[PDB]
Design a protein around this ligand. Structure first.
Ligand SMILES: O=C(CC(O)(CC(=O)NCCCCNCCCNC(=O)c1ccc(O)c(O)c1)C(=O)O)NCCCCNCCCNC(=O)c1ccc(O)c(O)c1
Ligand SMILES: [Ga+3]
Length: 173
């Protein structure tokens, strides 16, 4: 029953993607995925994803998160794909059984919010998710509604949609 990925042609790409303007810290204020919202857990803590543009035009991507022990810094590379705003994972060989990792910036105004679509295939199991990014940790009802609406348009119902809890530890860095 795991929810199938939509066809990539149904996933918008941000027109005229500006990689310099997309840089820096985004708070992951919402997310939806085909796999789960788990189902035996308190609501998750917010993470930050930091996009640093390298000289070769790929992104160094740092996920900053809080766990009971400490702040974690998980780093990967987004290499440009065929169109501005599309990426694939540099370190794909480091993911056992992974044959594909695709990123598509669906929309953004650069200084406030973004939505990013992700898709992965690992031993022929397809996973996809959408993140709602904010330059601030709080966002308007307006944006939360757009995101919910977008998620549903990709076949993700409301019980697959999660709004992480803002924290100060780790992600204020
Ligand atoms: O196999 C995976 C899954 C995946 O490749 C992709 C995946 O399925 N992501 C699911 C994210 C669902 C949304 N979660 C809630 C929202 C907050 N998270 C994100 O926005 C987000 C977005 C993208 C990510 O890849 C990610 O990890 C998280 C991934 O990188 O997470 N991860 C483990 C990789 C192990 C690498 N070898 C061990 C070294 C230690 N790990 C890392 O350094 C590292 C670095 C960057 C990573 O993204 C990472 O997951 C691990
Ligand atoms: Ga990861």
């Amino acid at each position: 029953d795991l929810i199938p990925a939509p066809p990539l042609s149904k996933v918008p790409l941000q027109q005229n993607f500006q990689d310099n303007q997309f840089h820096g810290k985004w708070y992951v204020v919402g997310f939806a995925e085909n796999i789960q919202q788990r189902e035996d857990k308190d609501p998750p803590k917010m993470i930050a994803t930091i996009y640093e543009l390298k000289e070769d035009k790929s992104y160094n991507v740092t996920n900053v998160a809080s766990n009971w022990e400490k702040c974690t810094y998980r780093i990967k590379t987004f290499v440009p794909g065929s169109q501005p705003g599309e990426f694939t994972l540099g370190e794909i060989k480091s993911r056992p059984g992974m044959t594909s990792y695709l990123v598509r910036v669906v929309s953004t105004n650069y200084n406030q919010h973004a939505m990013v679509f992700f898709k992965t295939v690992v031993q022929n199991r397809e996973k996809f998710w959408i993140t709602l990014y904010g330059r601030t940790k709080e966002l308007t009802s307006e944006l939360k509604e757009n995101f919910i609406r977008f998620s549903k348009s990709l076949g993700l119902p409301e019980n697959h949609i999660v709004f992480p809890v803002p924290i100060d530890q780790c992600i204020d860095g």
